[PDB]
Amino acid sequence: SMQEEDTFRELRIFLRNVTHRLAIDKRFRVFTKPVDPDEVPDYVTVIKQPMDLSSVISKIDLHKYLTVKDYLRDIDLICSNALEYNPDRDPGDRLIRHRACALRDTAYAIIKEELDEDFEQLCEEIQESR
Numbered sequence: 001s002m003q004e005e006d007t008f009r010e011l012r013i014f015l016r017n018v019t020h021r022l023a024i025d026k027r028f029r030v031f032t033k034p035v036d037p038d039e040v041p042d043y044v045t046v047i048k049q050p051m052d053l054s055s056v057i058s059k060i061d062l063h064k065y066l067t068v069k070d071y072l073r074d075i076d077l078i079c080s081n082a083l084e085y086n087p088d089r090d091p092g093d094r095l096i097r098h099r100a101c102a103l104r105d106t107a108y109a110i111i112k113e114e115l116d117e118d119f120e121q122l123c124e125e126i127q128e129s130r
């Protein structure tokens with residue numbers, strides 16, 4: 001129905017706003033763009049599903065997220081990709097990991113404070129109906 005379509009539009013608006021707030025945060029610059037194969041040619045071989053915040057915006061716009069849970073899977077993938085690709089004790093890897101955990105924790109905290117649980121539940125029920 002049009003009211004279901006309005007629901008998903010509201011979801012996209014909400015997700016774009018959360019993703020913009022993450023993308024403008026200086027700590028999260030490394031997560032804003034896909035990794036350049038030049039810098040890092042083994043990236044695309046180690047990490048089987050790369051994900052970054054510009055890809056997340058593209059997916060919102062392509063209507064790939066019908067629930068906040070589905071969007072959070074992608075935030076979680078940005079984080080887990082960084083933990084897996086940079087697992088060493090050296091400062092460069094520890095800084096990326098700390099920033100990745102911070103991305104994840106920040107996205108979850110914004111959603112906890114600003115997503116209405118009944119709105120998520122509505123999205124879930126429409127999704128489940130299709």
Ligand SMILES: C=C/C=N\C(=O)[C@H](CCCNC(=N)N)NC(C)=O
Pocket residue numbers: 093094095097098099100101102
């Ligand atoms: C789960 C993500 C949380 N953050 C981190 O990864 C950071 C940075 C890596 C250092 N320690 C190891 N991870 N071994 N660690 C903290 C909080 O000290």
Ligand SMILES: [Cl-]
Pocket residue numbers: none
């Ligand atoms: Cl830096």
